[PDB]
Amino acid sequence: TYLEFIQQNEERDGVRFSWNVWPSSRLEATRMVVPVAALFTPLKERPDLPPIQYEPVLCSRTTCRAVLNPLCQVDYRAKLWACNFCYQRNQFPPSYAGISELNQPAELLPQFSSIEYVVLRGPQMPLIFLYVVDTCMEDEDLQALKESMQMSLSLLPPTALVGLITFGRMVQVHELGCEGISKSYVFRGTKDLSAKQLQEMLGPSNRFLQPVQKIDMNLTDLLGELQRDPWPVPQGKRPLRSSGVALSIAVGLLECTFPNTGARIMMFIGGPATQGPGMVVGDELKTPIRSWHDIDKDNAKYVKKGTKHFEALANRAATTGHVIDIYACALDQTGLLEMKCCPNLTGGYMVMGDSFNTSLFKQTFQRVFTKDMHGQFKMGFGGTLEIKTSREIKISGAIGPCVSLNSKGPCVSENEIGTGGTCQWKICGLSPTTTLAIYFEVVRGAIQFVTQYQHSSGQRRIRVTTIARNWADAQTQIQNIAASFDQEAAAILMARLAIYRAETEDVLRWLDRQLIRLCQKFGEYHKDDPSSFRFSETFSLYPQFMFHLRRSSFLQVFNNSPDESSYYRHHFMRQDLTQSLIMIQPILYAYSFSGPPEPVLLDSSSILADRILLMDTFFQILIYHGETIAQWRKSGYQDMPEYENFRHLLQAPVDDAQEILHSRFPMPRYIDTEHGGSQARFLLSKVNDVSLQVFMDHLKKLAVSSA
Amino acid sequence: MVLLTMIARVADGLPLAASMQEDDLQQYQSQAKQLFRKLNEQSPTRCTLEAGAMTFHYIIEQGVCYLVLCEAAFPKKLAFAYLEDLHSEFDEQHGKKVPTVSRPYSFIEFDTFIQKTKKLYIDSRIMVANIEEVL
Amino acid sequence: VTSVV
Amino acid sequence: EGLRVVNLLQERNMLPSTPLKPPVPNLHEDIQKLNCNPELFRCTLTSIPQTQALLNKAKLPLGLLLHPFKDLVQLPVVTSSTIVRCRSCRTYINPFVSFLDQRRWKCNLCYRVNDVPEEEPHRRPEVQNATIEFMAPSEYMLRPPQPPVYLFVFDVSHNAVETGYLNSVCQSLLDNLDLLPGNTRTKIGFITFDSTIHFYGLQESLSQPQMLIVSDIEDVFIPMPENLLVNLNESKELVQDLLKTLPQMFTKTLETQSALGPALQAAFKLMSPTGGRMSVFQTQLPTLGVGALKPREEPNHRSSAKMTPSTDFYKKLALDCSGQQVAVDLFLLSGQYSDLASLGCISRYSAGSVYYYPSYHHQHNPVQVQKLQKELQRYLTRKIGFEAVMRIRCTKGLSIHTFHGNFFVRSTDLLSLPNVNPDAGYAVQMSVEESLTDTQLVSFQSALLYTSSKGERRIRVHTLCLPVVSTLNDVFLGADVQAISGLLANMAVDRSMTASLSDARDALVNAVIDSLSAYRSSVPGLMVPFSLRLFPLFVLALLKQKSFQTGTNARLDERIFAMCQVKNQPLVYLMLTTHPSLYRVDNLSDEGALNISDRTIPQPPILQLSVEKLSRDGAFLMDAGSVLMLWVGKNCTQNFLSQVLGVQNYASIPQPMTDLPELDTPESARIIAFISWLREQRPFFPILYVIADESPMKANFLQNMIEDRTESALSYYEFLLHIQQQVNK
Ligand SMILES: [Zn+2]
Ligand SMILES: [Zn+2]
């Protein structure tokens, strides 16, 4: 079963290809409508593989150096193995002299196509956490932020290093643990500093980065005593908030102290940057923060200059190997658009809300520090992804949270896509859900993913995934290829390409031309007869995924603020397939007396009066009460013991909502609305050129017409 | 915004208490002393005077004038509420000693209450005339 | 600077 | 008295055994009984020469020395609704005006007739007191009276931490926190600095003070708007906790460089909005940032007279402080060269004062430890005036042309005094611009407008009246030898900076030559008038003082600090330092001022400063003003050792002896009575050390024997012989 094949391969290898049978010829490789690409999850969790405390065995060929994998032909009599990439024959290392057929190494068993090694040779480096705290916010917001930071401090490993940087009009770098005084280095938030300058001005641990077990008591007291920025805010003015200099001072601090080691720069902002490099809006309250409409008419003089400042900090932190998180809570826009490259280039998180004093932010912030079945954070640091392919395969590029290492080889393709021109990428921060998208090109086929990263325990680890897909038989080329089409993976991989072009500017024109092309090659139709058009079960859902994608908030940036568009795209560019489909096409469940909860179509015809709907959009959990149920619930029938069945109906969507309102890392916003309610708009906009029915008729007309 | 504050006996313009922090001041402290000289028993008890980019506000209670200067963009509603807080406190503490003192600034130590009241207004967290006509 | 002293 | 002529070669014992009293101006009995106290205001020539030509013939400098803010026994305070002043030259009505129509008074400085306001007018206190204080009205102030603001700036480099000065300074502040002049408006702040600049925030809402490090040395700023300069009354507990914590913060410091300049720039910005007193404590050469100073090699006894500031940074900064009513006091506790010749400018031009503690160390130098403690006690508790201007007026025809002291001379001879302290002395040189043929009396009036520590504008006015004479003899008969010596020392200091030390020394010798040669050409030996019988003695003492001495092992900062004292101390302490009083104190007896109720107070005779007047069989006390040194002879009597020193033999007198014991012997009671009497006559507590033993390698006691010859200077007799050779050349 091809579905069982796709399911078991993502469970084992954390990968999903657009095509599982690849073009064996050059004539069919160029003619592929959707490129051969892979949704790859390097640190995907699975039912307990034993970590292999072995140095990975390598092909003794200079260029290749691939890892011993189940595709290698072995010879247990002659103690030799042949590399499946370069055909080199290798001798086994001394520690493998005793291997036999009835007791062979794990990396050769097919169940271990994806496997993790532990490299224990150097002394382990402590983790590093740098708090960068805005003080230009209301007391209730700041007090809640202080408590959230104090809570996170009680979760950190005893050996991890911590430092504190607070900012407002000035930037303060706190020297922790000084006794009886508590000193800090104050800098103007008006000019930037380089790492070198900051090192000379400031003069394994530091004065500024101390181990938790040595400093957790003093830091807890310091975080407790943090107060507002002492500088008054005159009437009709915004506070002077030097976000750009504070972030650059945090980046420069770690750059000259612990370069090339896992560190987390966690920045908490309560508003936009109003002073200094990186400025997003002026200090005049009469001037609103720029909107998307303000962007398209050149009425935003801070955007391009502010974006450039944070792109320089993003590449600085990513070259050094450090992570940048942005936790932004305010009632107005905060500038995520200009700062998005810091958590995007690094593997950092982007959390946005209305206020730090909510369950939404507090619960989202503590899920950052979720541990696994050993008390260890689900974080990885300094991830180096290296992809080794067969000679017939070349890597076009990657789209996702990563940076290029600019390493060359015969696996690099001239056609670069996203972050291309390399067979190596650095991912400063990965989680078990981090999902990259690697686009390939043809010029059993094999590809090997080698991800070296620093575990939250400090252990150096190497995850090796080796997959193989069949070359299409020449006598049944396009038929075997058509049967191996992953319509869900291809939609997300094409969506990744579409979002990347809009965010680096029409994109809908490219998305339509490929949908129509895919219909003509893999559909069934008589010429100039739209009603004759059919799609096999393999392709039937692709147009619907394409309909919701082109109308989504990922490509229709208006009706949202620029910060919201950058937040939505940020999380889509990192998620696996399952969550990505939910973003593009929210799932809808229906609740009524006439049966158990059932999934229903995202169309206005699903909005019934005697039904409760639960819509999950990934960012939102929405419960809609129909007009009949709304009146029944406004009446008071629930409290009466006669209608305990009406209690089940009102609590059934709430219960199902609670479960997913805990696993999701960016905790979704919860909405309890009904017919006539204001918040019912979110359901009416995701639901229903115009409608899907009209959209399909237009597609069939063009598919059966010109090529 | 920012300002200057003065308390003076209306009869002779004798200064009673003030408060000034620069880091100009000379042109508007002079204009303030002109007003104190002009004010008498027939002057309006509550007034606002326009000084271009700056704006004076005063009240007169018990022969004592409470004057404040601020940039023209400071809320007129808050300028008079600041003068009432000073007047109620000053009249309570020294209201009965005012018509007897003869030294200038016989209540310098009222500086303390002024600046602590002042900081509760320049932090968001009746009549109108021209000062140049009156002078 | 000028003074009355 | 004495119109008699004196031959200095046959006397040689000219120094009187009793203290020198200032000359009485030859005025009418009723005019003189109102004259200003000569400790506050005195002239080099009590008989003013009528013309400039007569003044030039006398070859003596004409000038005034004044101590205007001196602590007084009684001060008449006039609170009049109007200050009566002359309509033309703004002279305050004073006892030396002329009433004619009884409703009209004639100004004694410009002769303009004025009208007396409806407010026996000659019985008014303004006409009965030469020294008086006025309450100033609103026209005498540019802004509301400023509060008291005390900012303390401490060097915390590695050298400074090693000296341990920070401990006693913080302890003195704690002990004297309630004695700081001021009321509830008093503000206080603190800054430490090394290679960076450290502020200190003090809020009752926080567990502990906050140290805010400004590291941008090229671009200093104020890190916090509030809570750096805090109200002392409210935040008393917060200030006290900081003074107890500061000495413990920099114990293991490795910072060796000091950015004094940028720290003073930051301290200036912090005090700019209000003004006040800045107390700077520095221990080494500034070597980092603006105001850095190059090292210099110290001179030895071998280098000739081959002084000035190395930069104008601290002079410019001092002028910026003066404009914002900020005075800067400098405490230099350096063990090596620190270029005081450049650092002193921060205090000269801001009306501050400098204090020098050479080789200060908490363990190794106990004398400087106690000297700093006593000077800090006076410095923190004495009265203070803020944002002060002083004007000095004199009768038409007389013109001040050169000012001396710590201030900034504004246009039209206004003296800007960001602070005024009761221990400061000033000097002025004048000339006869128009012949005084009209009058027979001329007056001099100093007016000090200032803000008291209670926020009250006040004017202190002193008026001096002197007669005018027209003969050379009358000029000489009225000469004040001490005042002339003081003015010449201030002129020789300026000559050192302007020309050289050689020219300064020569002009001091030439002033004695030219004065007595002019006296000679208007009458065998060396003939001087009675009033100038000590003129060569005091000038010789001036030339052997640390300010002008030559062939000594004196170091750069020592000499500059000696000149800073010449420019800043009152006349009496310049005389006490230059020519200390020497007494024999092992044989005291009660012919003393035994009048003071229950105390006897011996009055031993003053001795001439020569080793010939000493004796190995006794003990001698030297009052140098700021210090008392009790030298004990090697063959001293057993009575003095056991009954005064509390010691059984000369060998067991402790090497550094910080003071005498108060034993239960009548000999001890006599010497404690005599020392207590000396100290009550001044306010900076002079430390007494008896450590001057024949072998304590600290017998610089002998350096004050200014009459004896040395390997690099003349004796008093040799000096007299050189004067006579040049007088009749
Ligand atoms: Zn190989
Ligand atoms: Zn006159």
Establish if D142 belongs to a structural domain.
Answer: no
> If you ran DSSP here, which 8-state letter would residue A375 be given?
S
- Domain residue limits at B70: 1-135
In angstroms, the CA D600 to CA A382 distance is 89
Q: Can you give the length of chain C in residues? A: 5
DSSP string, D341-404: HHHTHHHHTTT--EEE-TT--TTT-HHHHHHHHHHHHHHHHS--EEEEEEEEEE-TTEEEEEEE
* Calpha distance D315→D295 (Å, rounded): 19
The residues spanned by each domain of chain A are 1-52+114-124+379-472, 53-113, 125-378, 473-584+690-707, 585-689
Are C and A close enough to touch, i.e. 3+ CB pairs under 8 angstroms?
no
Buried b / exposed e along A285-324 (16+ C-beta atoms within 10 A): eeeebbbbeeeeeeebebbeebbebbbbbbebbbbbbbbb
Q: Strand A80-82 and strand A89-91: pairing?
A: antiparallel
D632 and D727 in a single domain? The answer is no
CB neighbour class for D214 (10 Å; exposed up to 12, middle 13-18, buried from 19): buried
Structure tokens at A224: 């407790």
Give the closest-approach CA distance of B2 to chain A in angstroms.
8
In angstroms, what is the span from residue A48 Cα to ligand 2's centroid?
106
> D336 and D237: one domain?
yes
Fold exhibited by the domain A125-378 = Rossmann fold (3.40.50)
Residue A66 C-alpha to ligand 1 middle, in angstroms?
5
How does DSSP classify residue A300? -
Token pair, residue A146, equals: 């202080």
**CA atoms of A236 and B119, how far apart (whole Å):** 16
Tokens of D51: 């013309």
* Alpha carbon of C3: minimum distance to chain D alpha carbons (Å): 8
Q: Which of D191, D246, D249 is nearest to D222 (CA)?
A: D191
Please give the angle made by the CA atoms of A161, A167 and A168, to the nearest 5 degrees. Answer: 170
Question: What DSSP string runs through A77-103?
Answer: TTTEEE-TTT--EEEPPGGGTT-BTTB
Q: What is the CA radius of gyration of chain A?
A: 27
**Gap between the Cα atoms of D660 and D644, Å rounded:** 7
Q: Please choose, from the candidates D225, D262, D421, the residue with its C-alpha nearest in 3D space to the C-alpha of residue D327.
A: D421
Three-state DSSP class for residue A674: strand
User: What distance in Å separates the CA atoms of residue A268 and residue A253, rounded to the nearest whole number?
Assistant: 17
DSSP string for residues in A123-145: PPPPPEEEEEEE--S-HHHHHHH
| D209: contact with A, CB 8 A cutoff | yes
Experimental approach:
X-ray
Closest CA to A545 of A503, A602, A483, A506: A602
Phi and psi, residue B33, nearest 5°: -70, -25
Q: How far is CA D146 from CA A94, A556, B32, B117, D149, in A?
A: 87, 63, 18, 19, 9
* DSSP count for chain D of H helices, then E strands: 20, 29
Cα D221 from chain centre:
35
In terms of C-beta density within 10 A (0-12 exposed, 13-18 middle, 19 or more buried), how is residue A23 classed? buried
CA of D323: which chain C residue's CA is closest? C1
Specify if D107 maps to a domain. yes
Tell me how many residue pairs between chain A and chain D have CB atoms under 8 A apart: 52
D28 in contact with B, Cβ within 8 Å: no
Burial of A420 (0-12, 13-18, 19+ CB in 10 A): middle
Helices A243-255 and A195-202 cross at an angle (nearest 10°) of 80
CB of D547 closer than 8 Å to CB of D26: no
In CATH, the number for domain A585-689 is: 3.40.20.10
Q: Say whether D414 and C4 touch across the interface (CB within 8 A).
A: no
- Give the contacts of D651 (CB within 8 A, at least 6 positions apart): none
Q: What is the rounded distance in angstroms from the CA atom of residue D196 to the CA atom of residue D262?
A: 9
Q: How many domains is chain B partitioned into structurally? A: 1
| 3-state helix, strand and coil shares in percent for chain B, rounded to the nearest 5 | 40, 25, 35
Residue A160 Cα to chain centre, angstroms = 25
- The span from the CA of D340 to the CA of D131, in Å, is 36
Q: How far is CA D62 from CA A600, D48, D96, D483, in A?
A: 112, 8, 21, 10
Pick one of 1.20.120.730, 3.20.20.70, 3.40.1160.10, 1.20.960.40 as the CATH number of A473-584+690-707: 1.20.120.730
| Domain shared by D570 and D611, yes or no | no
Give A371's contacts (C-beta < 8 A, 6+ positions apart): A155, A377, A378
Judge if D516 and D585 occupy the same domain: no
**Residue D108 alpha carbon to ligand 1 centre in Å:** 113
From ligand 2's centre to the CA of D85, what distance in Å?
8
Structural domain total, chain D: 5
Resolution in Å, one decimal, please. 2.4
Place of tokens 């020394």: D505
**CA distances, D168 to each of D149, D254, D372, D383 (Å):** 21, 22, 8, 22
Distance between CA atoms of A371 and A374, rounded to whole angstroms? 7
> What is the sign, positive or negative, of the torsion defined by CA atoms of D661, D663, D666, D667?
negative
Contacts of A629 (CB under 8 A, 6+ apart): A609, A610, A611, A612, A649, A650, A674
Phi-psi bin for D646: left (phi > 0), alpha (psi -120 to 50), beta?
A: left
| Residue A452: exposure state from Cβ atoms within 10 A (0-12, 13-18, ≥19) | buried
Interhelix angle D716-727/D535-544, rounded to 10 degrees, is 120
Contact of D470 with D54, CB cutoff 8 Å:
yes
CB D602 within 8 A of CB D592: yes
Residues contacting A213, CB < 8 A, separation 6+: A158, A159
Cα–Cα dist D63/D48, whole Å: 10
Q: Which residues of A make up each annotated binding site for Zn(2+)?
A: 59, 64, 83, 86
Give the Cα separation of A211 and A162 in Å (integer). Answer: 6
Phi, psi of D458 (to 5 degrees): -140, 150
Q: Give the A window 211-250 contacts with B, CB below 8 Å.
A: 228, 232-237
In the complex, which subunits touch C with 3 or more CB pairs below 8 angstroms?
Answer: D
Domain CATH number, residue B96: 3.30.450.50
Question: End-to-end alpha-carbon separation of chain C, Å?
Answer: 12
Tell me the C-alpha to C-alpha distance, in Å, between residue D661 and each of D563, D627, D646, D678, D694.
Answer: 35, 17, 7, 17, 20
CB D163 within 8 A of CB D333: yes
What distance in Å separates the CA atoms of residue B95 and residue D170, rounded to the nearest whole number?
42
The distance of A498 to chain D (nearest Cα, Å) reads 47
Residue A442 CA, ligand 1 centroid: distance in Å: 20
Structure tokens at D498: 């302007």
Q: Cα torsion for D97, D101, D102, D106, to the nearest 10°?
A: -10
State whether D249 and D354 are in the same domain: yes
Q: Which residues of A touch B125 (CB under 8 A)?
A: 138, 228, 232-233
Assign A426 to helix, strand or coil.
Answer: strand
User: Given this structure, which CATH class describes domain A1-52+114-124+379-472?
Assistant: mainly beta
Task: Retrieve residue D672's tokens.
Answer: 């404690």
**Eight-state DSSP code of residue A265:** E
Tell me the C-alpha to C-alpha distance, in Å, between residue D135 and each of A638, B104, D37, D41, D183.
85, 9, 22, 22, 18
Number of H helices, E strands in chain A: 21, 27
HSE (side-chain half, CA atoms, 13 Å) at B6: 27
| Residue the block writes with tokens 């391009």 | A304
D118 domain-assigned: yes
Structure tokens at A666: 């960016």
Which CATH number belongs to the domain containing residue D3 in this structure?
A: 1.20.120.730
On the CB side of D12, how many CA atoms lie within 13 Å of its CA?
15
CB contact under 8 A, A183 and D211: yes
Q: Are residues D324 and D433 in the same domain?
A: no
Range of the domain at D722: 1-21+469-579+709-729
Which residue of chain C has the CA closest to D137? C4
- Tokens representing A23 are 């073009």
Q: List the one residue out of D430, D439, D362, D432 whose CA is nearest residue D401.
A: D430
Superfamily (CATH) of domain A53-113? Zn-finger domain of Sec23/24 (2.30.30.380)
Task: Say yes or no: D194 and D293 in one domain.
Answer: yes
